Amino acid sequence: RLVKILLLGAGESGKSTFLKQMRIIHGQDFDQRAREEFRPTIYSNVIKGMRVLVDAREKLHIPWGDNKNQLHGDKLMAFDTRAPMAAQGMVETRVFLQYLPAIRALWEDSGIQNAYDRRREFQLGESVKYFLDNLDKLGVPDYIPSQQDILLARRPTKGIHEYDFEIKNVPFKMVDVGGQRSERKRWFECFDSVTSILFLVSSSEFDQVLMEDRQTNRLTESLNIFETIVNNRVFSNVSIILFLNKTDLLEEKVQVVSIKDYFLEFEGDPHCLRDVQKFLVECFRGKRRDPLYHHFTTAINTENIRLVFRDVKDTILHDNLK
Amino acid sequence: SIIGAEDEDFENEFQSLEQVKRRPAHLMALLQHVALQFEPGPLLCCLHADMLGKKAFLDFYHSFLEKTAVLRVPVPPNVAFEVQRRFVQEVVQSQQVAVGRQLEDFRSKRLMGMTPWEQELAQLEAWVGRDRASYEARERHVAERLLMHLEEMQHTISTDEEKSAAVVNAIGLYMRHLGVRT
Ligand SMILES: Nc1nc2c(ncn2[C@@H]2O[C@H](COP(=O)(O)OP(=O)(O)O)[C@@H](O)[C@H]2O)c(=O)[nH]1
Ligand code: ALF
Ligand SMILES: [Mg+2]
């Protein structure tokens, strides 16, 4: 009598963030304690991201905004990301404060801002900027991550995790897996007795390549993962819902980059959010060999996810009927 | 060259049919894959043909050739018109394109980590030795587990209870020929 929902998708598609919204909306949410557990992760996010920005400034040959910052850049590439704590994506507060000055100055350097604008050439999460723009609140000694910071915190998922919750006597078991190519080898261990599959796709990564090989287009990879999944007979009697996520990031992106420059099979106004969403929808629908539900979400917007999941919930129930 | 922020987190992270028809564990992964994704007939057809090389020709016929078999495959007109080695050889020939795509798709997905039992195939492909006989024993033992697993959760192969069973019996028959049983 349990409703078993699979969260599937490529790496960084919003799977865990969707699961945190479930907890917020249909669970006990996160209190000061729960949220305070994300601080180490958020500090790891900032430090490691700045170090990528600094390394990219040098390797891309982008002039410093201010040459004196070459010193901080160095104090940053000196951070040992392989030390025991940092290797688990955790940084202690007092360590974080020691680097705050070098980081805050670095973020103000116009040359670091230039590397950022060209992130599609290397590997970075858009969330670092959110946190970089909020250093004044992470700088406070008594810093406690807001609910918003918790949803933006970035922690790569590895393995299989289950989250049981309830929505009016109905029992729900939500399975969260990793999306990297190496984590996918594990998916098959949670395929049985599945009720539905929520398939997350970052609609904004059409101008990006994979972390696994730095060559494969990120949207191209989702299309292919979706193809193997939407055509597996093990799911023939399982509803599959598509979540074109990060819609907020796609809105910003279609203004500065043309998807036409990546998918020549595209037609229409590349700078029109509506035309790009139509195309993305057509590409996924086009992968089915022979009932495709979809929503445009922004997993970090609690209110957006509440409306959407309400609709997904009645879909997963009325379909499980036949 | 440029540093990735999640690069350290993941640090430690079937060319042709003729090449996989004698490797039971790898063939089971492909077989499994094809059964959940495409039309299982073509591949089961080529594996049984190769097994033929007289009474094991009536089986093959009622399973793949005769227009009514649960596992029918496209036959060249000429063949379907009419030596015994000619047809089988030809029938196989007309499955290549279909089996070529299935193979290709399987190789792509595997690079993507989307194919079944990569873990078992990794542990297996890992072990080293010069003892062919004992290496093959390892292949079979793994293949048994996989075959055992294919038989269990297979009602998902097809709705046609007869189809999914024609598929399982077809794979068991072939697995049996390579020394693999459940
Ligand atoms: N701006 C924005 N960020 C998002 C959205 N969804 C997820 N993220 C962020 O993208 C990163 C990866 O999200 P995550 O849940 O860890 O992806 P997973 O790898 O599929 O679990 C995080 O830092 C999330 O905060 C979104 O809709 N908009
Ligand atoms: F990038 Al993942 F789970 F797919 F953190
Ligand atoms: Mg995750």
Secondary structure layout:
The complex is a heterodimer of chains A (322) and B (182).
Chain A: E1 3-9, H1 15-26, H2 32-36, H3 39-60, H4 70-77, H5 93-108, H6 110-117, H7 127-132, H8 135-138, H9 147-152, E2 161-167, E3 170-176, H10 181-184, E4 196-202, H11 218-230, E5 239-245, H12 247-256, H13 273-285, E6 293-296, H14 302-319
Parallel strand pairs in A: 1-3, 1-4, 4-5, 5-6
Antiparallel strand pairs in A: 2-3
Helix pairs in contact in A: 3-4, 3-5, 3-6, 4-5
Chain B: H1 24-37, H2 41-52, H3 58-65, H4 84-93, H5 96-111, H6 118-126, H7 132-152, H8 161-177
The complex binds guanosine-5'-diphosphate, tetrafluoroaluminate ion (ALF) and magnesium ion (MG).
Concise structural overview:
The complex is a heterodimer of chains A (322) and B (182). Chain A is of the alpha/beta class.
The side-by-side strand order for the widest beta sheet of chain A comes to: 2-3-1-4-5-6
What percent of residues of chain B are in strands? Answer: under 5%
Structural class of chain A: alpha/beta
Shape of chain B: globular
Radius of gyration of chain A: 21 Å
As a percent range, the share of helical residues of chain B equals 55-70%
Q: What is the number of helices of chain B?
A: 8
Q: How many structural domains are formed by the residues of chain A?
A: 2
What is the approximate shape of chain A? Answer: globular
